[PDB]
Design an enzyme around this catalytic site. Structure first.
Site, PDB file in Angstrom:
ATOM      1  N   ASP A 140      57.610   0.291  66.391  1.00 31.84           N
ATOM      2  CA  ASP A 140      56.520  -0.682  66.414  1.00 31.84           C
ATOM      3  C   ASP A 140      55.207   0.010  66.062  1.00 31.84           C
ATOM      4  O   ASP A 140      54.576   0.615  66.933  1.00 31.84           O
ATOM      5  CB  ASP A 140      56.433  -1.325  67.793  1.00 31.84           C
ATOM      6  CG  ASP A 140      55.328  -2.348  67.892  1.00 31.84           C
ATOM      7  OD1 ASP A 140      54.785  -2.724  66.829  1.00 31.84           O
ATOM      8  OD2 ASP A 140      55.018  -2.774  69.026  1.00 31.84           O
ATOM      9  N   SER A 181      42.976  -5.362  52.866  1.00 28.89           N
ATOM     10  CA  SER A 181      43.561  -5.800  51.616  1.00 28.89           C
ATOM     11  C   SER A 181      42.470  -6.335  50.700  1.00 28.89           C
ATOM     12  O   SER A 181      41.464  -6.878  51.157  1.00 28.89           O
ATOM     13  CB  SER A 181      44.597  -6.885  51.901  1.00 28.89           C
ATOM     14  OG  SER A 181      45.079  -7.466  50.708  1.00 28.89           O
TER      15      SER A 181
END
EC number: 3.4.23.22
Length: 330
Positions: free
Chosen positions: A35, A199
Protein backbone atom coordinates in the site's frame (compact mmCIF):
# COMPACT_ATOMS: atom_id res chain seq x y z
CA UNK A 1 20.79 -5.91 -2.53
CA UNK A 2 17.52 -6.26 -4.42
CA UNK A 3 14.20 -8.04 -4.09
CA UNK A 4 11.57 -9.11 -6.61
CA UNK A 5 8.12 -10.50 -5.79
CA UNK A 6 5.06 -11.33 -7.84
CA UNK A 7 1.84 -9.55 -6.91
CA UNK A 8 -1.48 -11.21 -7.74
CA UNK A 9 -5.03 -9.81 -7.95
CA UNK A 10 -7.27 -11.07 -5.16
CA UNK A 11 -10.33 -11.46 -7.43
CA UNK A 12 -11.54 -11.16 -11.01
CA UNK A 13 -11.98 -7.38 -10.69
CA UNK A 14 -8.46 -6.51 -9.50
CA UNK A 15 -9.97 -5.11 -6.30
CA UNK A 16 -6.54 -5.37 -4.67
CA UNK A 17 -3.25 -7.23 -5.10
CA UNK A 18 -1.47 -9.57 -2.68
CA UNK A 19 2.26 -10.24 -2.45
CA UNK A 20 3.83 -13.04 -0.38
CA UNK A 21 5.99 -11.84 2.52
CA UNK A 22 8.17 -13.98 4.79
CA UNK A 23 8.02 -13.02 8.48
CA UNK A 24 9.99 -14.55 11.32
CA UNK A 25 12.24 -17.56 11.84
CA UNK A 26 11.33 -20.10 10.56
CA UNK A 27 9.56 -18.06 7.91
CA UNK A 28 5.82 -17.55 8.15
CA UNK A 29 4.52 -16.54 4.72
CA UNK A 30 1.60 -14.10 4.70
CA UNK A 31 0.00 -12.50 1.65
CA UNK A 32 0.07 -8.74 2.19
CA UNK A 33 -1.51 -5.80 0.37
CA UNK A 34 1.37 -3.49 -0.57
CA UNK A 35 0.00 0.00 0.00
CA UNK A 36 1.88 3.10 -1.21
CA UNK A 37 -0.83 5.17 0.54
CA UNK A 38 -0.03 4.11 4.11
CA UNK A 39 3.02 3.41 6.24
CA UNK A 40 2.19 0.53 8.63
CA UNK A 41 3.12 -3.11 8.13
CA UNK A 42 0.39 -4.92 10.05
CA UNK A 43 -0.74 -8.53 10.04
CA UNK A 44 -3.49 -10.82 11.19
CA UNK A 45 -1.95 -12.68 14.10
CA UNK A 46 -2.38 -15.10 16.98
CA UNK A 47 -3.48 -12.00 18.95
CA UNK A 48 -6.35 -11.05 16.63
CA UNK A 49 -9.78 -11.38 18.22
CA UNK A 50 -10.83 -14.86 17.12
CA UNK A 51 -14.27 -13.80 15.87
CA UNK A 52 -12.57 -11.30 13.54
CA UNK A 53 -10.45 -13.94 11.77
CA UNK A 54 -12.15 -15.78 8.88
CA UNK A 55 -9.70 -17.65 6.67
CA UNK A 56 -6.64 -15.36 6.85
CA UNK A 57 -3.20 -16.73 7.51
CA UNK A 58 -1.93 -15.46 10.85
CA UNK A 59 1.49 -14.49 12.16
CA UNK A 60 2.29 -16.20 15.47
CA UNK A 61 5.22 -14.34 17.08
CA UNK A 62 5.67 -16.98 19.78
CA UNK A 63 6.75 -19.43 17.04
CA UNK A 64 9.42 -17.05 15.66
CA UNK A 65 12.81 -17.25 17.34
CA UNK A 66 13.63 -13.74 16.06
CA UNK A 67 10.45 -11.99 17.22
CA UNK A 68 10.75 -9.49 20.07
CA UNK A 69 7.94 -7.51 21.66
CA UNK A 70 8.44 -3.78 21.10
CA UNK A 71 7.59 -2.95 24.67
CA UNK A 72 4.87 -0.36 25.17
CA UNK A 73 4.24 0.20 21.48
CA UNK A 74 0.71 0.28 20.10
CA UNK A 75 -0.76 1.18 16.75
CA UNK A 76 -4.15 2.16 15.37
CA UNK A 77 -5.02 3.09 11.81
CA UNK A 78 -8.08 4.18 9.84
CA UNK A 79 -8.17 4.03 6.06
CA UNK A 80 -9.97 6.18 3.51
CA UNK A 81 -12.62 3.51 2.97
CA UNK A 82 -13.59 3.58 6.65
CA UNK A 83 -11.83 0.34 7.59
CA UNK A 84 -9.51 0.16 10.56
CA UNK A 85 -7.23 -2.03 12.66
CA UNK A 86 -5.12 -1.77 15.80
CA UNK A 87 -2.85 -3.74 18.10
CA UNK A 88 0.66 -4.07 19.50
CA UNK A 89 4.08 -4.39 17.89
CA UNK A 90 6.90 -6.88 17.48
CA UNK A 91 10.18 -6.53 15.67
CA UNK A 92 11.13 -9.46 13.45
CA UNK A 93 12.90 -10.41 10.25
CA UNK A 94 10.87 -9.65 7.13
CA UNK A 95 11.79 -10.70 3.60
CA UNK A 96 10.16 -9.70 0.30
CA UNK A 97 11.23 -11.45 -2.86
CA UNK A 98 14.66 -12.29 -1.45
CA UNK A 99 15.31 -8.89 0.18
CA UNK A 100 15.64 -9.19 3.96
CA UNK A 101 15.22 -6.56 6.68
CA UNK A 102 16.07 -7.42 10.27
CA UNK A 103 14.37 -5.56 13.09
CA UNK A 104 11.31 -4.59 11.04
CA UNK A 105 8.32 -3.39 13.03
CA UNK A 106 5.57 -5.98 12.50
CA UNK A 107 2.31 -4.56 13.83
CA UNK A 108 0.18 -7.38 15.21
CA UNK A 109 -3.56 -6.82 14.97
CA UNK A 110 -5.65 -7.28 18.06
CA UNK A 111 -8.72 -5.82 16.31
CA UNK A 112 -9.69 -5.44 12.66
CA UNK A 113 -12.83 -3.95 11.15
CA UNK A 114 -15.40 -6.04 9.32
CA UNK A 115 -14.10 -5.37 5.82
CA UNK A 116 -10.76 -6.95 6.75
CA UNK A 117 -12.41 -9.97 8.36
CA UNK A 118 -14.62 -10.41 5.30
CA UNK A 119 -11.63 -10.51 2.92
CA UNK A 120 -10.02 -13.91 3.50
CA UNK A 121 -7.36 -13.27 0.85
CA UNK A 122 -5.56 -10.36 2.57
CA UNK A 123 -3.47 -11.29 5.60
CA UNK A 124 -2.40 -7.70 6.30
CA UNK A 125 -0.91 -4.57 4.77
CA UNK A 126 2.66 -3.52 3.96
CA UNK A 127 2.84 0.26 3.87
CA UNK A 128 5.10 1.99 1.36
CA UNK A 129 4.25 5.67 1.88
CA UNK A 130 6.59 7.86 3.93
CA UNK A 131 7.41 6.79 7.48
CA UNK A 132 6.06 10.08 8.85
CA UNK A 133 2.58 8.50 8.47
CA UNK A 134 3.41 5.43 10.57
CA UNK A 135 0.94 5.13 13.45
CA UNK A 136 3.07 3.34 16.07
CA UNK A 137 3.11 5.14 19.41
CA UNK A 138 5.01 6.34 21.35
CA UNK A 139 7.94 5.65 19.00
CA UNK A 140 7.08 5.94 15.32
CA UNK A 141 8.45 3.11 13.20
CA UNK A 142 9.98 2.93 9.72
CA UNK A 143 8.49 1.24 6.66
CA UNK A 144 10.05 -1.85 5.11
CA UNK A 145 11.36 0.30 2.24
CA UNK A 146 12.83 2.89 4.60
CA UNK A 147 14.64 0.16 6.54
CA UNK A 148 15.89 -1.55 3.37
CA UNK A 149 16.87 1.60 1.48
CA UNK A 150 20.50 1.90 2.56
CA UNK A 151 21.20 -1.72 1.55
CA UNK A 152 19.50 -1.50 -1.86
CA UNK A 153 21.54 -1.18 -5.03
CA UNK A 154 19.43 1.90 -5.80
CA UNK A 155 16.97 3.58 -3.36
CA UNK A 156 13.87 2.72 -5.38
CA UNK A 157 10.99 0.32 -5.66
CA UNK A 158 8.75 -0.25 -8.67
CA UNK A 159 5.09 -1.25 -9.04
CA UNK A 160 4.11 -3.17 -12.17
CA UNK A 161 0.49 -4.16 -11.55
CA UNK A 162 -1.29 -6.42 -13.99
CA UNK A 163 -4.71 -6.06 -15.55
CA UNK A 164 -6.53 -9.27 -14.63
CA UNK A 165 -3.08 -10.86 -14.32
CA UNK A 166 -0.10 -11.05 -11.96
CA UNK A 167 2.51 -8.32 -11.84
CA UNK A 168 5.68 -7.47 -9.93
CA UNK A 169 7.05 -5.37 -7.09
CA UNK A 170 10.83 -4.85 -7.39
CA UNK A 171 13.08 -3.30 -4.76
CA UNK A 172 16.46 -1.77 -5.48
CA UNK A 173 16.53 -1.88 -9.28
CA UNK A 174 14.62 -0.83 -12.39
CA UNK A 175 13.86 -3.73 -14.77
CA UNK A 176 14.43 -2.10 -18.14
CA UNK A 177 12.64 -5.01 -19.87
CA UNK A 178 9.38 -4.32 -18.02
CA UNK A 179 8.31 -1.15 -19.85
CA UNK A 180 8.26 0.44 -23.29
CA UNK A 181 9.75 3.77 -24.27
CA UNK A 182 11.26 5.92 -21.55
CA UNK A 183 10.36 6.64 -17.93
CA UNK A 184 9.15 10.19 -17.29
CA UNK A 185 9.95 11.43 -13.80
CA UNK A 186 7.90 14.03 -11.96
CA UNK A 187 8.27 15.91 -8.68
CA UNK A 188 6.89 14.59 -5.39
CA UNK A 189 5.72 16.48 -2.32
CA UNK A 190 6.17 14.55 0.92
CA UNK A 191 4.34 17.21 2.98
CA UNK A 192 1.31 14.95 3.58
CA UNK A 193 3.38 11.76 3.84
CA UNK A 194 2.19 10.47 0.44
CA UNK A 195 3.72 9.96 -2.99
CA UNK A 196 1.98 13.19 -4.03
CA UNK A 197 2.54 14.57 -7.51
CA UNK A 198 0.85 16.79 -10.10
CA UNK A 199 -0.52 15.35 -13.31
CA UNK A 200 -0.41 17.71 -16.29
CA UNK A 201 -3.91 16.94 -17.60
CA UNK A 202 -6.18 14.40 -19.20
CA UNK A 203 -8.02 13.21 -22.29
CA UNK A 204 -11.19 11.15 -22.71
CA UNK A 205 -11.08 8.54 -25.45
CA UNK A 206 -9.80 10.01 -28.70
CA UNK A 207 -10.58 13.53 -27.47
CA UNK A 208 -8.18 16.42 -27.23
CA UNK A 209 -5.87 16.63 -24.25
CA UNK A 210 -6.86 19.19 -21.60
CA UNK A 211 -3.82 20.78 -19.97
CA UNK A 212 -4.64 21.27 -16.29
CA UNK A 213 -2.77 20.53 -13.07
CA UNK A 214 -4.22 17.68 -11.00
CA UNK A 215 -2.53 17.11 -7.64
CA UNK A 216 -2.95 13.56 -6.37
CA UNK A 217 -1.30 10.57 -4.77
CA UNK A 218 0.04 7.35 -6.29
CA UNK A 219 -1.76 4.79 -4.11
CA UNK A 220 -1.45 1.07 -4.82
CA UNK A 221 -3.80 0.42 -1.91
CA UNK A 222 -6.78 2.16 -3.50
CA UNK A 223 -8.67 0.24 -6.21
CA UNK A 224 -10.08 3.07 -8.32
CA UNK A 225 -9.08 6.40 -9.87
CA UNK A 226 -10.52 9.36 -7.92
CA UNK A 227 -10.38 12.71 -9.74
CA UNK A 228 -12.07 16.12 -9.58
CA UNK A 229 -15.78 16.17 -10.33
CA UNK A 230 -15.29 18.22 -13.51
CA UNK A 231 -12.92 15.61 -14.97
CA UNK A 232 -15.08 12.66 -13.95
CA UNK A 233 -18.23 14.27 -15.39
CA UNK A 234 -16.41 14.85 -18.70
CA UNK A 235 -15.42 11.16 -18.79
CA UNK A 236 -18.84 9.66 -18.03
CA UNK A 237 -20.61 12.08 -20.38
CA UNK A 238 -19.05 10.00 -23.19
CA UNK A 239 -20.82 6.82 -22.01
CA UNK A 240 -24.47 6.50 -23.03
CA UNK A 241 -26.64 5.93 -19.99
CA UNK A 242 -23.94 6.59 -17.41
CA UNK A 243 -25.03 8.48 -14.32
CA UNK A 244 -23.97 9.27 -10.78
CA UNK A 245 -26.06 7.23 -8.34
CA UNK A 246 -26.24 8.43 -4.75
CA UNK A 247 -27.76 5.10 -3.73
CA UNK A 248 -24.94 3.05 -5.23
CA UNK A 249 -22.23 5.52 -4.22
CA UNK A 250 -20.80 6.71 -7.51
CA UNK A 251 -21.00 6.59 -11.27
CA UNK A 252 -22.63 3.54 -12.80
CA UNK A 253 -23.05 2.68 -16.46
CA UNK A 254 -24.87 0.10 -18.57
CA UNK A 255 -22.96 -3.18 -18.54
CA UNK A 256 -23.60 -3.33 -22.31
CA UNK A 257 -21.41 -0.25 -22.90
CA UNK A 258 -17.96 -0.12 -24.45
CA UNK A 259 -15.98 2.32 -22.31
CA UNK A 260 -13.60 4.93 -23.74
CA UNK A 261 -10.00 5.08 -22.63
CA UNK A 262 -8.74 7.73 -20.20
CA UNK A 263 -5.34 9.41 -20.63
CA UNK A 264 -3.46 11.21 -17.86
CA UNK A 265 -0.41 13.43 -18.26
CA UNK A 266 2.96 12.92 -16.63
CA UNK A 267 4.93 15.97 -17.65
CA UNK A 268 4.91 15.92 -21.44
CA UNK A 269 4.25 12.16 -21.48
CA UNK A 270 0.89 10.39 -21.54
CA UNK A 271 -0.37 7.21 -19.88
CA UNK A 272 -3.43 5.62 -21.52
CA UNK A 273 -5.84 3.62 -19.35
CA UNK A 274 -7.80 1.31 -21.70
CA UNK A 275 -11.57 1.47 -21.37
CA UNK A 276 -11.81 -2.11 -20.11
CA UNK A 277 -9.71 -1.21 -17.05
CA UNK A 278 -12.52 1.16 -15.99
CA UNK A 279 -15.19 -1.60 -15.83
CA UNK A 280 -15.75 -2.91 -12.28
CA UNK A 281 -18.65 -5.11 -13.20
CA UNK A 282 -22.20 -5.43 -11.96
CA UNK A 283 -23.12 -3.40 -8.89
CA UNK A 284 -24.72 -6.56 -7.49
CA UNK A 285 -24.69 -10.10 -8.80
CA UNK A 286 -26.69 -10.32 -12.01
CA UNK A 287 -27.34 -6.59 -12.37
CA UNK A 288 -27.01 -4.90 -15.75
CA UNK A 289 -25.73 -1.75 -14.02
CA UNK A 290 -21.94 -1.74 -13.80
CA UNK A 291 -19.71 0.21 -11.45
CA UNK A 292 -17.28 2.75 -12.86
CA UNK A 293 -13.55 2.72 -12.20
CA UNK A 294 -13.23 6.51 -12.39
CA UNK A 295 -15.02 8.29 -9.54
CA UNK A 296 -15.17 11.76 -8.07
CA UNK A 297 -12.71 12.75 -5.34
CA UNK A 298 -14.97 15.61 -4.22
CA UNK A 299 -15.80 13.89 -0.92
CA UNK A 300 -12.25 12.71 -0.18
CA UNK A 301 -10.13 15.85 0.02
CA UNK A 302 -7.43 14.48 -2.30
CA UNK A 303 -7.21 12.99 -5.78
CA UNK A 304 -6.08 9.36 -5.82
CA UNK A 305 -4.23 7.63 -8.67
CA UNK A 306 -5.21 4.15 -7.52
CA UNK A 307 -4.78 0.78 -9.18
CA UNK A 308 -6.97 1.66 -12.20
CA UNK A 309 -4.38 4.26 -13.18
CA UNK A 310 -1.20 2.64 -11.87
CA UNK A 311 -1.76 -0.72 -13.56
CA UNK A 312 -1.64 1.04 -16.94
CA UNK A 313 1.99 2.00 -16.20
CA UNK A 314 5.33 0.87 -14.91
CA UNK A 315 5.74 3.08 -11.84
CA UNK A 316 9.03 4.00 -10.14
CA UNK A 317 8.90 5.13 -6.51
CA UNK A 318 12.26 6.89 -6.25
CA UNK A 319 13.28 7.27 -2.60
CA UNK A 320 16.40 9.31 -3.22
CA UNK A 321 17.12 12.23 -0.89
CA UNK A 322 14.67 14.21 -3.01
CA UNK A 323 11.98 11.65 -3.89
CA UNK A 324 10.38 11.56 -7.33
CA UNK A 325 7.90 9.37 -9.21
CA UNK A 326 8.49 7.83 -12.63
CA UNK A 327 5.90 6.55 -15.10
CA UNK A 328 6.42 4.54 -18.28
CA UNK A 329 4.00 2.85 -20.63
CA UNK A 330 4.25 -0.93 -20.85
Amino acid sequence: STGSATTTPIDSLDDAYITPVQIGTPAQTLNLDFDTGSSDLWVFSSETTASEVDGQTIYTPSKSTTAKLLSGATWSISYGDGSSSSGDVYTDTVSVGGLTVTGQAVESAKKVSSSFTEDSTIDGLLGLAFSTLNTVSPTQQKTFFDNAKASLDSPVFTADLGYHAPGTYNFGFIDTTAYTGSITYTAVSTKQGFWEWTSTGYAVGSGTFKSTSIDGIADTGTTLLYLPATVVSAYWAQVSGAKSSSSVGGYVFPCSATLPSFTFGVGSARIVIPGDYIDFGPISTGSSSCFGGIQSSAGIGINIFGDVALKAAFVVFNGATTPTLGFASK
